[PDB]
Amino acid sequence: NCVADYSVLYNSASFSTFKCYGVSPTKLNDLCFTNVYADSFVIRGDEVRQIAPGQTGKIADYNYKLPDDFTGCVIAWNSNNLDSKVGGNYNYLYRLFRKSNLKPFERDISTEIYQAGSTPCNGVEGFNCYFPLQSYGFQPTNGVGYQPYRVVVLSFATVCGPKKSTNLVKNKCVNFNFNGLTGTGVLTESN
Amino acid sequence: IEEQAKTFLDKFNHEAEDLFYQSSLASWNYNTNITEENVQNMNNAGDKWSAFLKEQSTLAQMYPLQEIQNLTVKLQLQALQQNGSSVLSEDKSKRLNTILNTMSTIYSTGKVCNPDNPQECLLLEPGLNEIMANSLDYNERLWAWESWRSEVGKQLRPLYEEYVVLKNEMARANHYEDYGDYWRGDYEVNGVDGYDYSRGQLIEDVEHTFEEIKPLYEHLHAYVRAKLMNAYPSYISPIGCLPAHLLGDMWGRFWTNLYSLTVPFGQKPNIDVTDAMVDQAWDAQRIFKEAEKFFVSVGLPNMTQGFWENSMLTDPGNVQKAVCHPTAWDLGKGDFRILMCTKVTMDDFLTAHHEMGHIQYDMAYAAQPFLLRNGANEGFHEAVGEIMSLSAATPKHLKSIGLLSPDFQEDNETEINFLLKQALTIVGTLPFTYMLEKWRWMVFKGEIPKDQWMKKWWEMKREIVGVVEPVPHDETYCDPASLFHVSNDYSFIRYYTRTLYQFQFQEALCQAAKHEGPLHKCDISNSTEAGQKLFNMLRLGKSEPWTLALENVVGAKNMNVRPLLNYFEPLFTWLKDQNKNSFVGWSTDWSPY
Ligand SMILES: *[C@@H]1O[C@H](CO)[C@@H](O[C@@H]2O[C@H](CO)[C@@H](O)[C@H](O)[C@H]2NC(C)=O)[C@H](O)[C@H]1NC(C)=O
Numbered sequence: 001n002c003v004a005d006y007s008v009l010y011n012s013a014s015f016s017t018f019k020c021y022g023v024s025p026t027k028l029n030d031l032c033f034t035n036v037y038a039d040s041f042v043i044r045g046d047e048v049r050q051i052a053p054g055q056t057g058k059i060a061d062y063n064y065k066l067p068d069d070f071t072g073c074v075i076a077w078n079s080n081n082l083d084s085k086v087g088g089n090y091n092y093l094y095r096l097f098r099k100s101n102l103k104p105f106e107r108d109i110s111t112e113i114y115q116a117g118s119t120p121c122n123g124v125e126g127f128n129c130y131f132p133l134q135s136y137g138f139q140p141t142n143g144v145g146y147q148p149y150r151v152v153v154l155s156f157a158t159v160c161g162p163k164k165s166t167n168l169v170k171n172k173c174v175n176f177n178f179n180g181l182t183g184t185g186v187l188t189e190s191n
Numbered sequence: 192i193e194e195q196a197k198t199f200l201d202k203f204n205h206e207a208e209d210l211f212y213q214s215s216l217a218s219w220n221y222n223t224n225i226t227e228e229n230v231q232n233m234n235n236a237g238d239k240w241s242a243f244l245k246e247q248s249t250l251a252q253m254y255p256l257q258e259i260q261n262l263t264v265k266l267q268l269q270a271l272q273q274n275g276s277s278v279l280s281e282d283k284s285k286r287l288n289t290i291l292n293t294m295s296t297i298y299s300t301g302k303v304c305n306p307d308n309p310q311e312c313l314l315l316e317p318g319l320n321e322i323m324a325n326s327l328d329y330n331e332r333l334w335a336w337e338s339w340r341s342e343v344g345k346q347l348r349p350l351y352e353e354y355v356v357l358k359n360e361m362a363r364a365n366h367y368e369d370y371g372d373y374w375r376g377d378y379e380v381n382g383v384d385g386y387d388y389s390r391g392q393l394i395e396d397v398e399h400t401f402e403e404i405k406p407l408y409e410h411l412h413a414y415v416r417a418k419l420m421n422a423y424p425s426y427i428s429p430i431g432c433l434p435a436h437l438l439g440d441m442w443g444r445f446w447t448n449l450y451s452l453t454v455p456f457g458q459k460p461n462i463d464v465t466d467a468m469v470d471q472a473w474d475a476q477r478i479f480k481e482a483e484k485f486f487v488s489v490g491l492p493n494m495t496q497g498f499w500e501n502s503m504l505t506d507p508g509n510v511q512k513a514v515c516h517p518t519a520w521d522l523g524k525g526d527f528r529i530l531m532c533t534k535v536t537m538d539d540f541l542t543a544h545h546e547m548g549h550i551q552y553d554m555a556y557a558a559q560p561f562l563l564r565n566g567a568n569e570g571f572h573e574a575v576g577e578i579m580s581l582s583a584a585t586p587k588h589l590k591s592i593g594l595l596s597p598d599f600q601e602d603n604e605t606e607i608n609f610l611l612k613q614a615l616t617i618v619g620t621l622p623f624t625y626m627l628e629k630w631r632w633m634v635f636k637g638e639i640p641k642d643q644w645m646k647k648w649w650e651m652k653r654e655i656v657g658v659v660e661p662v663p664h665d666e667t668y669c670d671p672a673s674l675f676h677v678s679n680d681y682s683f684i685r686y687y688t689r690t691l692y693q694f695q696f697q698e699a700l701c702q703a704a705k706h707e708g709p710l711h712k713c714d715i716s717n718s719t720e721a722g723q724k725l726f727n728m729l730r731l732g733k734s735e736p737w738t739l740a741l742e743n744v745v746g747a748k749n750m751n752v753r754p755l756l757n758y759f760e761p762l763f764t765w766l767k768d769q770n771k772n773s774f775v776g777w778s779t780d781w782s783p784y
Pocket residue numbers: 197261263264
């Protein structure tokens with residue numbers, strides 16, 4: 001139920017990646033849908049390579065999935081000055097293990113001990129069984145691939161684009177359009 | 192079952208790369224800014240790292256290693272499941288720790304006194320090694336040499352006699368028959384189909400290459416003896432072994448410092464570019480960008496940025512307490528940095544390539560597991576730095592980088608003056624580098640018994656090295672223990688292996704580049720396929736064996752000494768021309784006493 005100038009994000013050079021997978025971005029001023037949903041979080045740079053349609057590995061299998069058929073894009077930027085810390089930052093979490101690789105947009109915000117092979121376990125989580133939640137450790141002096149990046153996902157009727165207007169010429173023969181209508185003539189001020 | 196080991200080692204690798212970072216970063220901060228708070232910090236960080244590694248290792252010991260199919264997780268389990276210590280009884284463990292600190296403190300703190308004035312004494316490196324590197328007074332060299340052995344080496348004899356026992360109990364309790372077989376175990380390869388390599392196989396293969404080197408060393412020994420008779424007249428025979436106190440340091444480890452006594456044609460200026468560096472007013476920043484240019488030129492990626500801010504390349508305008516010893520640091524988390532404090536000298540211009548050549552390998556295997564981010568053997572890890580320093584030292588590189596004039600001429604006599612300085616350094620150490628490990632391997636197994644330890648040493652000095660005791664010795668001495676690698680408990684054999692791999696790497700990349708002349712002239716500046724052949728070994732870490740990685744660099748599945756020999760054929764041709772009138776090799780019966 002609002003206008004959405006994607007053209008600002010597309011033009012702004014602050015982003016380390018701005019990449020589209022169900023749409024080509026300049027058309028977003030014309031393309032429209034019922035909703036758009038924004039997902040937002042912080043990740044290691046080399047692992048941002050796992051955030052696309054149909055990919056595999058630690059994020060792609062065990063955080064959240066974009067489908068191969070993802071109707072949308074993906075943006076990301078440097079966050080070193082904010083999200084890394086001198087003593088390290090550990091506020092960010094990830095669950096490393098889970099039986100069955102996740103489904104499209106699926107969320108497993110639950111945790112129990114993962115466990116492997118034929119063996120019973122009740123907490124403890126040293127041998128054969130491990131607690132799958134872990135923290136990150138973002139530190140400013142990391143290599144560029146281990147530094148923190150802010151990431152936003154967009155999955156793409158009410159959310160239209162900025163349908164901009166021309167200047168208006170009066171008392172001249174003109175090929176006009178107003179709202180969802182068209183016409184040609186001389187536009188004179190009426191009473 | 193393998194998923195238990197896999198997801199154990201996934202948790203281990205995700206934890207270890209953080210705990211090692213906060214440990215090694217505190218270690219970095221201490222070495223670059225020394226304070227007691229930084230010491231107490233980096234020690235309690237190292238405590239928490241070590242406590243994690245051992246507390247995980249007791250779990251790594253429960254996984255059955257024969258139930259593992261994939262090589263790269265078997266290699267990671269075996270590297271975490273190792274026991275090493277704790278095999279010993281707790282009192283024998285503390286006793287071994289006490290002995291290692293005792294041999295370390297005796298070597299590092301040991302004083303040698305002057306018999307003419309006992310109020311003056313010398314530590315090892317300041318003054319006492321300065322005599323051995325730069326004095327020509329035979330009687331002062333002999334005093335420093337025998338007083339080190341009798342005043343400090345004799346203290347280490349009765350400690351080395353107990354260290355060998357406790358290390359052998361540790362090795363046996365790890366199921367290795369002796370502690371030398373434990374050390375050889377680095378090079379061991381199994382289950383990779385034909386690429387396999389036995390712990391024992393190094394023992395014969397090192398001797399099978401060393402018996403190709405001997406003719407080059409026998410003409411170098413004859414040449415150096417014929418020279419040293421002019422430096423030390425009446426003391427040296429034209430056919431004898433060389434007296435050990437005359438060999439350029441406290442042990443005779445390298446002949447490199449004999450050059451002023453042994454030089455071919457010293458009227459030709461042995462080439463330097465320190466003048467060109469100060470005339471172009473180069474600083475550390477320029478030196479290191481002119482170093483980086485070689486790597487991006489051959490076909491490698493430029494530095495991880497934060498390298499430049501977080502590295503220390505020079506001394507701080509503050510009167511800082513820091514170690515200026517040039518060191519390449521990997522901290523984990525992709526954090527690469529050098530700690531040094533450079534001065535405008537061509538030695539540091541080459542050392543910028545030497546240390547950056549460590550970082551460029553540490554970057555290529557950064558995709559590997561933490562347990563596997565190491566050289567394919569302990570010879571690879573230094574040889575891969577030196578093949579950069581070799582190329583940067585060439586006159587073709589030095590004119591192309593703007594460090595020599597376009598009208599300057601190189602000549603044969605400049606080649607021979609350089610190559611002999613290389614030979615005294617590179618080749619002359621190899622009899623000792625083989626002999627010290629042969630003696631120690633035969634001591635750990637008891638092939639040399641505790642009533643013939645020193646008797647067999649001086650037989651091997653005379654037979655293998657052509658070097659003779661300045662004065663007779665007995666089993667109250669330990670002349671091996673008079674050295675750092677024997678007193679501070681370090682395996683020495685890596686230096687023999689690195690001295691083959693260095694030239695095997697170089698000549699393969701020089702053939703890949705199609706170099707037109709002698710191997711010591713080879714430059715890989717503005718190549719590309721030399722960087723491609725280098726890279727395919729660089730990105731494996733430990734995950735593939737050195738016997739597989741060598742055939743991608745060199746084209747050989749094993750070590751070969753040929754390439755080192757080739758590097759010296761121009762000099763050997765001349766050494767065979769200089770000593771036609773002389774006796775060559777040595778008598779083991781002859782002695783200076
Ligand atoms: C076990 O070995 C296999 C191959 O021997 C490895 O399989 C590769 O795994 C990566 C992802 O980690 C894939 O991109 C490759 O396509 C796989 N290769 C093949 C031919 O299947 C596997 O990674 C090894 N196990 C572990 C834990 O590393």
